Design a binder for this molecule. Sequence first.
Ligand code: A1L0C
Ligand code: A1L0C
Lengths: 231, 200, 235, 234, 214, 202, 232, 212, 239
Amino acid sequence: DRGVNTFSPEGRLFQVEYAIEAIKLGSTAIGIQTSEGVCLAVEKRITSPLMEPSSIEKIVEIDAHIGCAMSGLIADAKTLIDKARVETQNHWFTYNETMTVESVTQAVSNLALQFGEEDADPGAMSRPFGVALLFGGVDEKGPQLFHMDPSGTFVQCDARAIGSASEGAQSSLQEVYHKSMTLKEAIKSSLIILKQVMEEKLNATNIELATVQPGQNFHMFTKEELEEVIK
Amino acid sequence: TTTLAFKFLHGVIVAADSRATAGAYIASQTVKKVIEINPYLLGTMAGGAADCSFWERLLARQCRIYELRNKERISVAAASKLLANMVYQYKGMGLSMGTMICGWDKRGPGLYYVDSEGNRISGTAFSVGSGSVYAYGVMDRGYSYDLKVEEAYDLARRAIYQATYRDAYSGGAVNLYHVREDGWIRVSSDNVADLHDKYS
Amino acid sequence: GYDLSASTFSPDGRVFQVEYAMKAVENSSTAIGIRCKDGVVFGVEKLVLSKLYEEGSNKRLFNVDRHVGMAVAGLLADARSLADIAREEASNFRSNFGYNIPLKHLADRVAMYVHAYTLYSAVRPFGCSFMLGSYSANDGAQLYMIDPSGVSYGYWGCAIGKARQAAKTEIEKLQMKEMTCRDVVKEVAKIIYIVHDEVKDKAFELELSWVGELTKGRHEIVPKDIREEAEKYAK
Amino acid sequence: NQYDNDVTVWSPQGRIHQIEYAMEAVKQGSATVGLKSKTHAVLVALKRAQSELAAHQKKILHVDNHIGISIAGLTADARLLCNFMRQECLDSRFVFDRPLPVSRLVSLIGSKTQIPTQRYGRRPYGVGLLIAGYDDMGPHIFQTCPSANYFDCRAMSIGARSQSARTYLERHMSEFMECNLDELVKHGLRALRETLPAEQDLTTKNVSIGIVGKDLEFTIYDDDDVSPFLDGLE
Amino acid sequence: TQNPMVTGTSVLGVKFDGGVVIAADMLGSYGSLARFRNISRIMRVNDSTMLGASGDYADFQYLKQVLGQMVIDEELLGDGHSYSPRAIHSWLTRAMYSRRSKMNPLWNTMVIGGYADGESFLGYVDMLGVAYEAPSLATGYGAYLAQPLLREVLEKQPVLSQTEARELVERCMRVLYYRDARSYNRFQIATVTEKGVEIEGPLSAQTNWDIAHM
Amino acid sequence: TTIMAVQFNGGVVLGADSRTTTGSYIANRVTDKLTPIHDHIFCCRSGSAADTQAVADAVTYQLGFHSIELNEPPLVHTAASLFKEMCYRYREDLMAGIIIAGWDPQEGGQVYSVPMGGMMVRQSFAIGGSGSSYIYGYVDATYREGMTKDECLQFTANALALAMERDGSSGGVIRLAAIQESGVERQVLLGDQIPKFTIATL
Amino acid sequence: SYDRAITVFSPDGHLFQVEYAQEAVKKGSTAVGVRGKDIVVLGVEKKSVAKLQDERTVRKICALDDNVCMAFAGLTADARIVINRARVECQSHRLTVEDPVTVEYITRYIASLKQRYTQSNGRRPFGISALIVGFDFDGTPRLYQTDPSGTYHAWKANAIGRGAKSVREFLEKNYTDDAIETDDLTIKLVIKALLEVVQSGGKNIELAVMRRDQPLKILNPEEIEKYVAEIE
Amino acid sequence: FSPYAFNGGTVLAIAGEDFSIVASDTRLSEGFSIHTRDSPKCYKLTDKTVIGCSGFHGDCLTLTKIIEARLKMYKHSNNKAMTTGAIAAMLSTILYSRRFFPYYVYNIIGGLDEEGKGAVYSFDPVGSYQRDSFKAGGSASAMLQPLLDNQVGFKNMQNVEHVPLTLDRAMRLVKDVFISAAERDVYTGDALRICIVTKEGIREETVPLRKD
Amino acid sequence: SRRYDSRTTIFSPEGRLYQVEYAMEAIGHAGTCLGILANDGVLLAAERRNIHKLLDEVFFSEKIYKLNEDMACSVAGITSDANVLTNELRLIAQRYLLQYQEPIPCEQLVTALCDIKQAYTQFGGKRPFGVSLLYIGWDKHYGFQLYQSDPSGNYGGWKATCIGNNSAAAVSMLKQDYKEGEMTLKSALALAVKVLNKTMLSAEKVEIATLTRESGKTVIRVLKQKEVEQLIKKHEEEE
Ligand SMILES: *[B]([O])([O])[C]([C][C]([C])[C])[N]C(=O)C1=[C]N([C]2[C][C][C][C][C]2)N=N1
Ligand SMILES: *[B]([O])([O])[C]([C][C]([C])[C])[N]C(=O)C1=[C]N([C]2[C][C][C][C][C]2)N=N1
């Protein structure tokens, strides 16, 4: 038996390595960054017809200009999502201005490795958050998509896919995405890629798409909107 | 300071003067005593400029965070209750603020008065500030629940005008707001000097 | 299984963890200390692991006070924190009693702090040994040595590190007592050139620090000119 | 099998397996070179990237106007240490109203990283740092590791396959002092290129440059700002 | 320290061509009583810095030991870096303000005189944390009596010589002995140049009492 | 209260009155103000009786423990530094006017003054208490360098006697102490043995 | 105080402690839930139906507020702690906001506290699942389900505890838009679901309905016997 | 024991469409004596923002140091310099943090906004603030405010065409109002420091005043 | 430190809590305690496991304790754990009476002690209380009551129950002998004696306590040696 802060022989924290393996069992969420806004789409994955699909919130609102798509242990992501919401609200109170997308991802990545048994307090994490996040927003630099995992490493990507079928989805984005692709073109690409890697026939109640454009705010496609692009 | 608010048939009317003083000296005459919490929430300020500004800004940050978690706009009763509990912690410490929360939630228009002392009451017509006594006179006199929008704007403007004429700590311009079901709108911002030429 | 914690005795009555911490001091470079008629000379053979390092990097000689010196062996990270612990004790003592802390008391105070890491499971014993040298008009020339177990003793000529059993036979031929400080420096640099292995080890820088009447009771690093000449005498 | 689980467990050979495993974390990171002349200090970091649509991770970070660092190892750990160094530099400018000497800031990092390797339940910082700064004693290039040890070097390289870069720096170190910024930044770029595989070569999107000198505050060149230095290498 | 006990009077300070000169009388007053007539109120921080404190003497002795440790601590590292007169002044300003913000200040008024990197530095820190730099300083009752004299010489001759500044300091000390009821005719004169900090004294002034016969 | 300490070649000479008054009433007319901190280190107490006793006990404890660890006779300056620390630390809570005087192998006979505020200054002779104000001019005009251990005892007895007559808070007997390298020698001066000065009469 | 990490990840990215907490929920009594139009029902199987035990002191259905009530499955001792903490939040929500809590708000709080115990030091995860059922201010019946991990979902009809899969499959094929048409109809669908995972159902079933603008109403044995006769 | 000291000093701030002038006297005083004759109350925050403080010098020296550190920390996490409006909003929260032991400082931030037009923010001791065109704070704030109102704001004038505030006309106005404040206020005198914030950086001008 | 840890509050593969289950095994090897609810009162018939020819009688009882004015209890398990538990029960009842100035209801008291028992099985890393309790009392809301409690923190109200040595054998006997709703104190004592004998008696090997109501006052009393002796003889007449 080992402690939570134990390094392996290859130089990797065991706990973090197992937390990254827990994100391969979560739903897939494809994010595509363009010049006219960011687009996020997640696979809801309902396991029962009695289960209400509107209670599954894989994509949340961090602020008016920032969205968030998560994968892996959804319950652990509720603590990271609240930190991000309080961080962007705190920034506004102190500087009277919106926080940048990279700044929000940085503040959420700081808690990633904040865990341990010894030399800790009552309200301290005992393990790492087994969840990955896809931050998409619009600041002074325009549309920006960020990715944060259990290790606490946040990087920027033009197109990212996290979840169970990430490997298959990531490759399908590498040859269908270009720098001049429109936001409407990105929404179709994501939907097409999502439909391929999914088990259940994609429909209006299965997935959940969200978009954040320069002049607009965070927006979640409804049933009607989703149906339009589905056909 | 002179701020008034009253809810008639067509929503809530909010009016205030724009003058800050540093004793006998008139610090400024373009101060905004009405702060916007959000599109359906208004907040007036009276008393300590730094006190009302910092605490109403703190309430606005609390209302935005509340709407992200519950995925819905906060009510006028909850907004005032939030602010009331905030200032209660520092009760009898020097805080000086007399705000009025107005908005249009589920139960129609709502107008609450919240001071630093501890008060938190709901009503149909309030008036905070050093010139509030003068504003009450004109307000009540011309107040009617079936007042027309144009007639309500006149009443609110005339009420702040007479209060700035009698009170030395009230002056500047007269900012008028109108809260509706679709959200509050900035009616006007007439200057007191121009109002004096029209009422004479 | 009786050697995983410092708060465990083995059947024979030994604390294996503290014995394992002494193994780290026997893997480090050799540092010697010689006390004479009016001072203490520290000689540490700094083993340069790379050519990219600057001449003077990773020093093993620090001034814990203005009259006290400190040569170390074993882990450097642990020894650096012990040097800062010794500085605090020396500084706290001057602000309480109003004068320089005696070497005997400073050694004992720092040895007691080192012995506290050899009793619990929450911490591990320091993996380093060190010598403390000083000079005082009222006292004289003192030289103490503390190991990983927290034991501090007085000496005439001490030696720690890998080649300490071979460096102690070279210091036994010297008559330190009657010897001065300028004559000892040479002998100190000669013993470090004899015990140092030119085969197993590579390049090595010779460090030299002293403290006595010569430097008016102030511990310093031996002057470049005097160090350069002493290095030529060794060769 | 039972001596490599805790940092407070000395092994029979007199070593701490946990600290040795923490030094492997720095060995998995991308190479980062750090050399200096007599008036400048340069840190050329080779950025990495997973997917083709992903951006290159930042390797060079701001600490102060006279201090800059290059990371190699745990991303999160690096940030943690960077915040401490930034706070330490701020305190020095607030109290003494002057830049904190680079060497004095390196001792603060060595003490903060030593504590964790002696307490039970804690772990060492899994990251290596290459600090480039300039103060009253000229330009410096320090190197800190997971085992709370720091070295004062004329040139240094840490990360994956940094032995190829270190070898190159060891034969060109003599001609570093009397050499202008332009030539000294290209001397480090050549060393950073040596660690890379034979095929792929340095570009303007996988290389980061950080310079600090006697009459220049720490600057970080990334995309279009590194072409100037890049142009001039075979 | 809400109420000072044994206090010191004014401390003079004037920058000259190649250094700074500081003077202070050696007297510890207990109210109106001259209790201790041989206490040094000037301390040499390091090779390029000197300090002269007025006010509560117990507070000065606490600062003297808190500063001495700092200098000693920095010299143990031996990395070449050393605290400059401006860095010590800054440190004192933060220490005075911090104490004043906690409603428990060190009742003192310091005059920091130094000489580093070819520049003469003359700082001034009071108990409230108020600090500034000037060509000539004077604390206590010296700001009303000696300050006017020092300022009247630096207006027609901005740059002074070592001998000229020293001759001006003696004139100010003599004037302070005629009008300050808490001063002694025994003072010290510290000078910081390129060679270091040097303290002389006790010295005295040449008082004349011709007006007593008229 | 009228305490006094002077020094000579060998060591030092201490002296104090013995009156403890609570208003206009003498609660203790034979108080022993001279307190031994160590073998060759004494201290005269002045100010608050409860404050000086508490501090002296604390210092005596700290000095005893410090001297047992160092295995050497404690320095008089060390004892004075300890006193100064507590006097300065709790200057807003204590009311003391301690005068540390002893003898050590290093510096010999030393006299230290630690007034109310908590400052520490070494002098050749020191006077403290409420009755020391009346003998300030006397000690300045009578003290001469080179006084022997016998002249110091007569100098202290003369000054204390002069302060006891003018001060209402000073009186009773006179407790002297001569500390040298040989040891400490206490001595009390009662009625007839107390120096007398003819009161000016017409 | 204890600060040991109880719940930690494993080689396959699993959280064993939470998986063992879900194993304890499977050994609990079956708790069924069915959302109707103007009535929410809750059914709980009574395993230990001893004749010498006051049945009012050992119920699985509780009321958090006047519009919210819940049922559980797993360790009874833990359910009590979770039920009383949720009751304090309902009273706290009423003190801060004039209106009463919504079904989802309290479900979110109950699930958030469960996730909190699966990631803190010195504690172990809760071994219970909850079926929070109630009505909002709009009159919209609600039904949520929280589990040991801390995740909750809205449902139309769900079952928890031992043999929850068998009952869930029966609800999927039986829950239509005609089975919950009338008050009695919705109550009869809950009693039918419990009849496939119980022995001689009728005297071992305890259900409580919750109509609009009305407090929790526990139907006694006599009333439950009348419903079993109509399902024959 | 009083933890505050009135040190005097006045600071001015006028905003244009392409510039922003922030001026202040350089005399530090206490009671009736003059501490130093060379103590400007203008501090360069960023490349387009200058802060001016007056009042208790101890708080001015500390507030300024805090602002300098807050700007550095903000640039480290946000990777960009703080704007004039963000520096004004942050100062409000810093002044109000010490609400029960407030800084006796009168701050007047002057710089350029995002668009590029001059911006002036006036602050109160506890933290309250607002953006205006011109502002005067200090010991001569009541002596200069009325003049700026008339001259720059064109108040109480019936026949004026309201000519745009040029940078050359504003430079004379700051010099003129400070020459009148040195004739009446005993805390204003000796030297006037003028900082001009434009798009080409911050320029500094120094003019002498009365010494009596 | 983490190797010596026994991990008491930890789940197991089956989803059970070992420590709590091992504490339940220790309660099955303790003196049999039985409680019966009647119409005019409730009693506690526990068997004494502390029998010897050299033991003193000193105290008023050995297993049955008084919580407050209208409540009593009988423990079964670790003797030292009950001393801690019953002392805490008295504190809870005094704290409640100091707050509302009324006797604490029986179910509220039992519930409060169960919250403490369940806290030792979820966090703290300490072993659980190895004791099972039986409570009898009277309140204005439900009158006479009888509750049981185990080491896990679980509790429940009963009419007749038994904890200890032969709980399962005694419980079965009570099941086929308890006339629910028509039981009197006098007829309940027979039941206790009848069940206590068939699950093990002398008048010194057992201890009985009854709780009845007299003139708006709860009366708790332990039956005397003679008082019990007669009961034992009357059961022999029917055998
Ligand atoms: B009003 O007159 O109440 C007005 C309302 C504010 C602007 C929202 N208040 C002020 O004018 C005002 C005055 N002061 C302080 C008075 C004491 C000196 C410092 C200013 N604060 N707000
Ligand atoms: B002396 O007069 O200063 C003397 C010095 C002491 C004895 C060390 N002080 C006192 O006379 C004195 C008396 N008291 C108390 C007053 C209240 C009643 C008890 C005695 N404190 N100091």
